[PDB]
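Entry type: protein chain
Record version: 2
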Amino acid sequence: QKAITLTHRGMTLRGMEHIPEKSLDEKVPAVILFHGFTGTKLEPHRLFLKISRALEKQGIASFRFDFLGSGESDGDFEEMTVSKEIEEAHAIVDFVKRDGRIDPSHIYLLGLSMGGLVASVVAGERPNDVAKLILMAPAGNMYELITETIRQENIDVTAPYFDHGGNLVGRSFLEDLQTINVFERAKPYDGPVLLIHGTEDDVVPHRVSHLYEQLCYGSRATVHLIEGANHTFDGHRWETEVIKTILGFVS
């Protein structure tokens, strides 16, 4: 693997690429992984890196950036919004499509939770660029999720930011999120979709993967439940099943 960078609107996104041996023989498929809210390109217990490594062993490249304001990338988290991440994700797809090592007919998008929201929107907006889509615990109904939290925590939405445990969430994030109908913008994508969701996910309930199936994908979606797993699959058994399900879906 190798650290990589991508400039967007004058700021630097920082990431990793994993390029398999097979790229010498031929242009290879690639997975682009988009991380979740307050997450990073690594995700808990190295989940995204472990996926990259398993994909690489199967001859599949991968690319994963920290969004601006997250992880190692330029910017502050308070300025992040979902619309900005969508724009950055589109720029990352552009970047992988410019990579002569990558088969542009076999680019797969993967997103975790809010990154799955972003992935599902990007795929809906350029379906012909996206051969397969992987949604991990996709937070389709995040507005309801953030709505539910401001009621429980009595969050004052006039504030310029909300301090989410040391991650500052700007007011612009809420205003922007309220304008995004996720299931509508995702609906046009007709490729195969894998939804992976932990059955004990308290952050995004696993019924939401059914919602994506009912509202966006229908018979093209494969819903794969991980029995007992929490939101980020914080368990070796759970993570092994997650990784193998992904590899089975892209092989």
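Comment: The chain has one domain: 1-251.
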